[PDB]
Amino acid sequence: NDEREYLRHFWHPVCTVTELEKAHPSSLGPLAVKLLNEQLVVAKLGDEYVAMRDRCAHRSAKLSLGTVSGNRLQCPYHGWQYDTHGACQLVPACPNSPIPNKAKVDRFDCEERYGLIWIRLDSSFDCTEIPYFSAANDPRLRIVIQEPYWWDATAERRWENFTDFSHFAFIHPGTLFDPNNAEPPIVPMDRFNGQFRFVYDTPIGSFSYTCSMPFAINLEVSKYSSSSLHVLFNVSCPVDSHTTKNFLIFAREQSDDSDYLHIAFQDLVLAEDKPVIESQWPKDAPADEVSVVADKVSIQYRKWLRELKEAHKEGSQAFRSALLDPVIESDRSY
Amino acid sequence: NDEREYLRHFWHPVCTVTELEKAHPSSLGPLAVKLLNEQLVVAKLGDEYVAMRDRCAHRSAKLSLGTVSGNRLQCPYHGWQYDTHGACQLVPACPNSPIPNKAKVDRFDCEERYGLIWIRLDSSFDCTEIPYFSAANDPRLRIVIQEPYWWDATAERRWENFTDFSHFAFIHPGTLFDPNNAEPPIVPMDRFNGQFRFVYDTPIGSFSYTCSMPFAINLEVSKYSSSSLHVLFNVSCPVDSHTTKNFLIFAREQSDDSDYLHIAFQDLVLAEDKPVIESQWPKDAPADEVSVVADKVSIQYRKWLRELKEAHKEGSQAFRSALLDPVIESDRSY
Amino acid sequence: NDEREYLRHFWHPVCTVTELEKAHPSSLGPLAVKLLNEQLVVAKLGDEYVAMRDRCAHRSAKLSLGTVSGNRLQCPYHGWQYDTHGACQLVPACPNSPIPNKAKVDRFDCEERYGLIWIRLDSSFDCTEIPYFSAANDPRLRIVIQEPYWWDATAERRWENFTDFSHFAFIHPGTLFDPNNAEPPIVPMDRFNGQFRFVYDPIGSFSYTCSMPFAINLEVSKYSSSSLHVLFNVSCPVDSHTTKNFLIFAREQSDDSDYLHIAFQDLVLAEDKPVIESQWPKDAPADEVSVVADKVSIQYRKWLRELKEAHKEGSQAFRSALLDPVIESDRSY
Amino acid sequence: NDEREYLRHFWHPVCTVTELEKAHPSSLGPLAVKLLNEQLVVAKLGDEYVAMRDRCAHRSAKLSLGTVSGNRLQCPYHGWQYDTHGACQLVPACPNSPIPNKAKVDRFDCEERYGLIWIRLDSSFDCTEIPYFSAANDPRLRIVIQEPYWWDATAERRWENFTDFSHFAFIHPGTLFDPNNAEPPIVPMDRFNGQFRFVYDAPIGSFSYTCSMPFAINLEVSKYSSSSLHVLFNVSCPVDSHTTKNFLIFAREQSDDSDYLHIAFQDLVLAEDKPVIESQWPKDAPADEVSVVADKVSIQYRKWLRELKEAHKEGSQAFRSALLDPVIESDRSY
Amino acid sequence: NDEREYLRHFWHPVCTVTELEKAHPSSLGPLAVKLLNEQLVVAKLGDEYVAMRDRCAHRSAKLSLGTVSGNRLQCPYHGWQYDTHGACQLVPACPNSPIPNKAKVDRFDCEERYGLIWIRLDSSFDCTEIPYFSAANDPRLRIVIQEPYWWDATAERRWENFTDFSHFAFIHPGTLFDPNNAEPPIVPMDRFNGQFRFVYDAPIGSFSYTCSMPFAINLEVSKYSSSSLHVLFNVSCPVDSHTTKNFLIFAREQSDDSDYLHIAFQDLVLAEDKPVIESQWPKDAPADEVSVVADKVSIQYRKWLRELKEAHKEGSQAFRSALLDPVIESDRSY
Amino acid sequence: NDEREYLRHFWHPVCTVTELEKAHPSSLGPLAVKLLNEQLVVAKLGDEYVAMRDRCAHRSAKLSLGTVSGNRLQCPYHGWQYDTHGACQLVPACPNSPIPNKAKVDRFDCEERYGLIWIRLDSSFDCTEIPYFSAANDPRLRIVIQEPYWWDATAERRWENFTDFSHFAFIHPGTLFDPNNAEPPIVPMDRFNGQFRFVYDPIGSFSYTCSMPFAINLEVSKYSSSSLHVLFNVSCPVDSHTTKNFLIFAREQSDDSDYLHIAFQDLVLAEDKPVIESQWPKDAPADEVSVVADKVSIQYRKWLRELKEAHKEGSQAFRSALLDPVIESDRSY
Ligand SMILES: Cn1cnc2c1c(=O)[nH]c(=O)n2C
Ligand code: FES
Ligand code: FES
Ligand code: FES
Ligand code: FES
Ligand code: FES
Ligand code: FES
Ligand SMILES: [Fe+3]
Ligand SMILES: [Fe+3]
Ligand SMILES: [Fe+3]
Numbered sequence A, B: 001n002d003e004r005e006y007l008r009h010f011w012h013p014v015c016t017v018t019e020l021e022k023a024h025p026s027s028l029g030p031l032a033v034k035l036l037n038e039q040l041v042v043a044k045l046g047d048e049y050v051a052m053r054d055r056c057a058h059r060s061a062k063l064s065l066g067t068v069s070g071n072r073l074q075c076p077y078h079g080w081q082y083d084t085h086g087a088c089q090l091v092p093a094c095p096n097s098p099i100p101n102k103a104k105v106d107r108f109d110c111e112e113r114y115g116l117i118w119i120r121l122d123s124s125f126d127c128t129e130i131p132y133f134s135a136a137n138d139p140r141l142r143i144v145i146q147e148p149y150w151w152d153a154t155a156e157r158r159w160e161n162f163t164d165f166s167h168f169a170f171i172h173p174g175t176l177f178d179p180n181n182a183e184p185p186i187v188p189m190d191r192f193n194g195q196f197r198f199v200y201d202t203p204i205g206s207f208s209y210t211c212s213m214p215f216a217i218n219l220e221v222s223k224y225s226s227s228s229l230h231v232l233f234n235v236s237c238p239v240d241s242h243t244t245k246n247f248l249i250f251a252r253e254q255s256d257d258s259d260y261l262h263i264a265f266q267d268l269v270l271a272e273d274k275p276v277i278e279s280q281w282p283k284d285a286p287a288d289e290v291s292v293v294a295d296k297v298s299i300q301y302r303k304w305l306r307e308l309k310e311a312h313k314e315g316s317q318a319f320r321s322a323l324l325d326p327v328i329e330s331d332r333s334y
Numbered sequence C, F: 001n002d003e004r005e006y007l008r009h010f011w012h013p014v015c016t017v018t019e020l021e022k023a024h025p026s027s028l029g030p031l032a033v034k035l036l037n038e039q040l041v042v043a044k045l046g047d048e049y050v051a052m053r054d055r056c057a058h059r060s061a062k063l064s065l066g067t068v069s070g071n072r073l074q075c076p077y078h079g080w081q082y083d084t085h086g087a088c089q090l091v092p093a094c095p096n097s098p099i100p101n102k103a104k105v106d107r108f109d110c111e112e113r114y115g116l117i118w119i120r121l122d123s124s125f126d127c128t129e130i131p132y133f134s135a136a137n138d139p140r141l142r143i144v145i146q147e148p149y150w151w152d153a154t155a156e157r158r159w160e161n162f163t164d165f166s167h168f169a170f171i172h173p174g175t176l177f178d179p180n181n182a183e184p185p186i187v188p189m190d191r192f193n194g195q196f197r198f199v200y201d202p203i204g205s206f207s208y209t210c211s212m213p214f215a216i217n218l219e220v221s222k223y224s225s226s227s228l229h230v231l232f233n234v235s236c237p238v239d240s241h242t243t244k245n246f247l248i249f250a251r252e253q254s255d256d257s258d259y260l261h262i263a264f265q266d267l268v269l270a271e272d273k274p275v276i277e278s279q280w281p282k283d284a285p286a287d288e289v290s291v292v293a294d295k296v297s298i299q300y301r302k303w304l305r306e307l308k309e310a311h312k313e314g315s316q317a318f319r320s321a322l323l324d325p326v327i328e329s330d331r332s333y
Numbered sequence D, E: 001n002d003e004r005e006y007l008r009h010f011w012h013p014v015c016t017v018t019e020l021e022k023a024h025p026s027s028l029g030p031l032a033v034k035l036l037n038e039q040l041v042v043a044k045l046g047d048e049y050v051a052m053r054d055r056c057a058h059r060s061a062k063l064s065l066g067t068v069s070g071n072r073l074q075c076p077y078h079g080w081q082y083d084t085h086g087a088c089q090l091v092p093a094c095p096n097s098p099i100p101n102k103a104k105v106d107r108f109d110c111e112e113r114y115g116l117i118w119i120r121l122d123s124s125f126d127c128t129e130i131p132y133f134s135a136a137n138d139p140r141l142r143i144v145i146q147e148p149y150w151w152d153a154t155a156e157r158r159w160e161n162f163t164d165f166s167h168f169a170f171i172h173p174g175t176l177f178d179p180n181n182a183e184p185p186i187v188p189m190d191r192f193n194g195q196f197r198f199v200y201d202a203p204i205g206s207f208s209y210t211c212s213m214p215f216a217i218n219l220e221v222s223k224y225s226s227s228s229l230h231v232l233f234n235v236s237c238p239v240d241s242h243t244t245k246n247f248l249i250f251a252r253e254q255s256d257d258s259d260y261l262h263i264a265f266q267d268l269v270l271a272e273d274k275p276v277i278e279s280q281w282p283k284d285a286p287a288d289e290v291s292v293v294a295d296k297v298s299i300q301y302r303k304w305l306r307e308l309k310e311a312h313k314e315g316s317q318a319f320r321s322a323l324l325d326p327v328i329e330s331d332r333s334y
């Protein structure tokens, strides 16, 4: 728990906009979500997406069992009404008495982007941004948001599974494995603007990764001589110590085919990964795991996470430098 | 059964395009559907949506358990390949022998329109068209296709439920009932181009019905002084003697709000109707039902159905006249 | 199909009063019930229990999905209101217009007795009565109405199971079998007032009063003691293969727990249930082979056959077949 | 936790007499019950209801799987028989040998009252009594004992829910809320004989509460100029740290109507409360909850419970005074 | 329908001996079984397996709920005891009275062979025998009786599935399909002694079929220059018009490996067939099915079944000739 | 937690050979098993049954989701291949590079005997053996391995249930209770070769050879007859509250059905199961009260305590506590 405090400083996705709209017939929420083992409630009050602790200040009922009425979230028990800042503005039992100063619940940064709702629990370092999705606002690409998928595995283990190629022959022999490539070689990895950037050439094409730390991956798959750009954007919500809620958004230039051709293929790949990733134990990678040279991406990821954790302990400027300082291995200029 | 043969001459919806694409990972089908108690299979072969009897000519296996490979539907048992016309073009066991002339399955009219797949089982009268949806190709309106809903009631009983107002105070008191209107009066009903056309004024607005016989309803709800056009398009697939698969498509001019605000409200209305309509017995309306003057729409609907049934027995020209001749009660010019 | 028509002339229980009051939060019903494959609705309108066909005259919705509103049963669909005679008295869409003459639904005899609701589908012969329960109005006895139990067996087969002793050694060896009696003898059987009456004994007594066709009143008494126990069992013939069965029991010594008796009765029923449900075909064919020990069921089947034949001959023949006395015993009635 | 030790000194209901009689075919029990996380067994041994620890002294089998034999409880495993004092009186394997001195199990004060079975786990302070039910032995009233209901909420939170009126508009708008009363004013509350007493009302009627501390509530509802007395008696069994088994007994003077009219209504009320009360978290009310002036009853209840917990730590005399000393703020003469 | 009458003249398997022994704790049965829509009961009475109608002559209870007592089957209801001939020999209620002449139930020819129980419902033609299993009494072979498997398909369609090779590439591509063989050529088929005999093969091995009409298949798979004989014996019980209970027995010369290697493989093969065969409709093959030259085995099978059905209508002598007359088209000397 | 460490020194059954062969279509495994709360994987590599920790050294995936490939167990994730000693011998991503020294997983003793797979987690004291089953290699007897049965009870409580006669009247009144014996007397108990040996009788004999700590070999013989019946029951201590129990039975007269015996044994187990599962806390506390009839369990508990204490003293103390003879009877060994 002590181990995870630095993660409160990043933006994490908690639901799709669709999930929020489907939660209650109002289409405005509320929706209960859980992030880093914190119980939160999300709602649309007026034009704004709001995130609060899911716990009424009065008698601790869950506001996620309440009702959105315009610009208020009403508690289901004694009807206290909370505004967009988390402050109670109506105590129905005492409508003329002054509202206690303590009648407020914690309110957190909450923004929509790419069709997902993002929450940042701690904004005090003021140096993190919502992860980068390269296909946003590209009018050449059709964008599809998949339904979220829940895994009994941590966000770190999910991230390392997504960026590893070594497992293709064994987990994805008929779906992703390329017998003409088999073992892609180690590549240079750059840190830039709080992202890992690395590229694999096929060259006939390229797999270009832009990974916004700590849990988001933007993968651009391109081919020359063809206009066949495909973008996969994967991000894991660290729900608690053993669970992730995962979001996949994909974009494609050739969009005359069915969205479900791609959804079904992506779901097959995920079904192949799922039982093996969920089997990994203990849930957090212990020091006794044995790496080999082909594990470069995982090794460098673990190293940067540990540096962020240590920098968080030293405070805001140390964290901003650990996250945002460039570290270039490649021949590229950014 | 004898009673339902005339319905084979109309276009009936059997699935959404989404359902077809989701059926199999290929995104091309096949999908088993049932229409007028006939077992059919739908697939996308090349650019074309095809509908065939779901029964291989060889040993009667279901083609809906097979596989679409480009422009062929392959039977799952001995791999006979059927083309878009229902004709077997490959017998894998006898690849050099001539294919028997009998190695063909019945192929039916099948067209996509409005995001649904429509089938017409008998095209011999050559005088029916896919029902009219007024919001198609209107760029002012956002269109949403709901997931189909299955009811243990007939298409006729569903149609009469959708066009009746008398039940609002009792089934829809908090959703659709207007205590300021309560009992809308009987209105003139026109037959034109195989549609029932009738309008109710509110006037502050109007509910304008265009009902393509026998089972489709297009309802335009408009208000003057506001750009608040709403269109509801409801059509029932007569699956068998006691079941319907129902499709709702809705369009709206003011589209800044959530689609799920409307979906949830429409689902609530449907949940209020469902148990009462499913309770009606026997499933087909018998002669002993007692009508009152407020039942005009239902009475006139039943009369036109009976005329179509009788005209079908007399043949193509009689049916075309029964369906397409105008019969005007209103002051309108069409 | 036609061979059960004569059963429509009798009163049959369809539910407990408790089931009716629990069906809807108003405690007035309506409750859907099924009797001889007829779909019926029961409701309490004012002081009257009413039973109608569960089908509105307008568009055939089930009235059992509707609401009781004072002296009316209101259809859930378009709100037609039916009075206690099954006649529509309000068409909300046309409140001024005359109500069509056809706007009526069939209404059936419906009466509460003993805490059960009874329906008689055909009252034309005017000669049947609600079965006799001997403990009613006896202040010495505590009466308990058990929850109904459903069996995949006909009412005739259930009746013959209840009145047979031959099966105790094989079905009830630890519960009802008496190793020192084993084979109770054939006893005389009387027909009186539409009831079979017979008695099995100088210490005790098992006294049966069976109101034809499906009700059994069993009085168990012990001489030199005041320990009267009454069992009243009656089967509702729901359809051709199903019964809904009611058991009411009364006892003089009532300082013990009701549940001592309920648990024992439920154990006995659970022993009978799989064997009776296995009997096939559901209705006893003419090829069943009887022995002398089967006197009760032989006589039962003979009287039922007489009632079926008399029903075809009409009202007076049926009244005679049902109510004429036929006395085998020494007892005076 | 050890914060609960003081509750062991009170009488708590564990089952209805009906539940005991139904548990076993003999109608004498045994029945397993749980109270303050203790596993107990109840049985009728002769003319007495007896409560013992549900654990045989021999090899720790549950006596609740055993049988009542005469006036003793017989273990299911090797047949040891325990008397009403928890002492073993027969060891079937060694019938003539002396029974070990330690062959005994703890027993607890156990009494029937009002059709419930009550247990007091710690009788050493000897100053608590079974709670007061005002309708007992009043022949004008028909009494109905409802079946117990289980909630995932503590007895303290259940008590505060039962005595609060503030929540009616939000949880019970169609069942209990009175639009013409809305917010009853704060009333004086008296402590007398281990009970909270307070009354709500020219006044037409009265809501008169007698609350036997800590978890029992007797509510008399009367109407002046009418003879329609209604009594609700509600008491929660604290089963463990997060669970209650709850008993409702209701009495009414006007009794020609159906018991199930009232049972259905009470069940609807409970179904409305249940999800909101179960959502309150953490399960025990923390110090950070925010009260308003309308919460007087809850505030005073928590204050008295705190006093009882502190007095328990100082011993029998302090506890007796904290419980039984009167504190009057109304003008009622007692 | 009455099209099935002729099948009553053959021996059909109804259960394994294992199933009979497991049915009841005594290991003697009774076991209820169903054959050609007849409800029967099987029991071990003394040294004999006996089949009776599952219906007591007294009050029609199922004897399969009863018990074997000595060498008799005792009804569960009033304890009548039936001997191996179906005759009642004890009426417990009337132990000294004469037993009614009609106190008897129909019994049927019933024999154990190969670890299965076989029943012949109509023995009046007396010209059929229990099917041939070639591995019985061959000490070189280890025999395994699989658990029966139930399919929603007729015995005729199951037989044609078992003997067809055409479907391997499509139903069994990873299990049975041989890319280097693909389409075995048509072979001569012999009728001899009520069996179809045909062999598939310088040739390395052999697939040798002996098919005891109508539903049993003995397949010997051998490899020349090796001692790896494998035998598959498959027989379908026609339970009713749309259901089969199927028995597979397999024998192998090479037997150091695990039985479950083979059981797992056979189960996978059956799981591949099952959905396709169950989809065939209507359940009985109609005249409109289209055969090709590769279907010789199925064509000849249907032709012989038609001859047996027609000969049955002409009587015992015609049936015996249709079944047992030889028709040789190979050059094998028998 | 620490009080069960000494159990790691014994051989425990973890599965039948049948369960291993059915786990994967290859019939070679792998199969996940749990023993003393350790997660293990069992597989057949060549002619050897192997048991490893179910956790790859690379990224901690479960090897039980992998595949046997000849003489290797292959991890499902990145395909590392482990030999019979638990050492990785192929890293497919780096086929030329040297394999890290840390690329090994723990490997445990694993042996087939009697149709069960046995694992010994700690072989350091080198003095324990797979329990004795007397019917093995006896051509006169037919041997049947039952399917394992899982109970929510510890292996010690299961052992004491199996060897107690006192409970027959109360748990097994219709199956095992003999009304003409009722209370079998205390008998002498011998410790020999790490087994408890004791005999109950001049017509018959119940002869127990109990290999410590959890295995029971029971020979039931009848003098002047050739009807030897052997029951071999052994409990796998899966975790702190669960056992996976194996029953093997052998009989001389084997012309009857295996299922006559299986059904009877299953009936006896179903009678014990709810009572044994109710015992709480799961491990017997020191406050349990014994009587003289409890001699078998008293002596059992004493020997287990001696083994636990000796384990703390080390290898020679444990060997002595386990294998030293302690003879109470007249018999010669
Ligand atoms: C007590 N009890 C419970 N069920 C019954 C009896 C009985 O006494 N006779 C009897 O026939 N039946 C069916
Ligand atoms: S708990 Fe939220 S208003 Fe009281
Ligand atoms: S059944 Fe379709 S190819 Fe044979
Ligand atoms: S169906 Fe009953 S009022 Fe219309
Ligand atoms: S455990 Fe209770 S008598 Fe032995
Ligand atoms: S029904 Fe079989 S003995 Fe009576
Ligand atoms: S986790 Fe086993 S090879 Fe990587
Ligand atoms: Fe993967
Ligand atoms: Fe409606
Ligand atoms: Fe009985």
Ligand SMILES: [Fe+3]
Pocket: D161, D167, D171, D172, D269, D273
């Ligand atoms: Fe409430």
Ligand SMILES: [Fe+3]
Pocket: E161, E167, E171, E172, E269, E273
């Ligand atoms: Fe096959």
Ligand SMILES: [Fe+3]
Pocket: F161, F167, F171, F172, F268, F272
């Ligand atoms: Fe036992």
